[PDB]
Amino acid sequence: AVPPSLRLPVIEAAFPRQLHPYWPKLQETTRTWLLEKRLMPADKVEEYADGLCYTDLMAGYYLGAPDEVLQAIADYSAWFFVWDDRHDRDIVHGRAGAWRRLRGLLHTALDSPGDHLHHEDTLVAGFADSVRRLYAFLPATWNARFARHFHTVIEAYDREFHNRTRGIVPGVEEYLELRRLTFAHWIWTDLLEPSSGCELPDAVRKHPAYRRAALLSQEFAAWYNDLCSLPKEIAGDEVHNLGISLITHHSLTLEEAIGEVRRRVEECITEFLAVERDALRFADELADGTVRGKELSGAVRANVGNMRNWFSSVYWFHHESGRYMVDSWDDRSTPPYVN
Ligand SMILES: O=P(O)(O)C(O)(Cc1cccnc1)P(=O)(O)O
Ligand SMILES: [Mg+2]
Ligand SMILES: [Mg+2]
Ligand SMILES: [Mg+2]
Secondary structure (H helix, E strand, O other), rough: OOOOOOHHHHHHHOOOOOOOOHHHHHHHHHHHHHHHHOOOOHHHHHHHHHHHHHHHHHOOOOOOHHHHHHHHHHHHHHHHHHHHHHHHHHHHHOOOHHHHHHHHHHHHHHHOOOHHHOOOOOHHHHHHHHHHHHOOOOOHHHHHHHHHHHHHHHHHHHHHHHHOOOOOOOOOOHHHHHHHHHOOOHHHHHHHHHHOOOOOOOHHHOHHHHHHHHHHHHHHHHHHHHHHHHHHHOOOOHHHOOHHHHHHHHHOOHHHHHHHHHHHHHHHHHHHHHOOOOOOHHHHHHEEEEEOHHHHHHHHHHHHHHHHHHHHHHHHHHHHHHOOOOOOOOOOOOOOOOH
């Protein structure tokens, strides 16, 4: 039972969940990875890790991925989450020096992950080992594009640190541009390609049907999270949320922004359904008769399928994960799973 303020019938009706066959071992390896990289303490991994559903989220998205591709994707996704918790914990304690060093370590490790596998900062070491495994699957042009995209993601996070510190809530349009980057839309879009085993040429992945579907996929995920994390994020003094920009810059009620947020999420789905047909026609055009044509068609059709998979994974993730159950915490401002 999804609460009705969050219930999306088109999702439940026409985007049935899928699950990767590797998920059971995926869940365990990542929990152990979290334990051995010391990205969380012992008792909170044992208590909270499984119930945070970070492996479920990715096992429901990257269908068809090689087990070791999925495993690296899921460690980095579990890493992405704790980096968000460390980023929010630096803000809450004005650790602007620590954030800045880490932010420069992260910028550096992203280009030379091997050189950081054993860095003193555990969070930098974990990231270096997931990114290093991420870099082994495809040519260094993919690896470079991944770095270019993550370099901008870090910078977006630095813009957030200075937004929450100086009290600035972004404007709605400033937020929609920033939210593509803090959510890391293009990271997740990049990782569609090791999951289907193929770097796409610029001409394929930048076709307007591919690009618009890839975009609407992430806009839904980012904006459904805003709808669903809004209570947690208000209680944690967070200001980066479409709901929050609409309240402070368009003088909307709490209940009015939530409907405008819900309404914008809903149109993401119906717009995706349209361009999905364009993107799938494009996949079939790519099968011109040649070998590389057949492969490029299959890779586009798998990635587009996983663009569709993202909706249901994200949707059910936000009702199953303990990360958003602010109502079950003794302290509504400090999630019990962060340090
Ligand atoms: O779980 P959260 O904190 O609501 C979030 O989605 C965490 C997150 C960060 C980056 C990518 N995906 C999720 P955020 O971006 O802070 O809104
Ligand atoms: Mg967050
Ligand atoms: Mg965040
Ligand atoms: Mg959020």
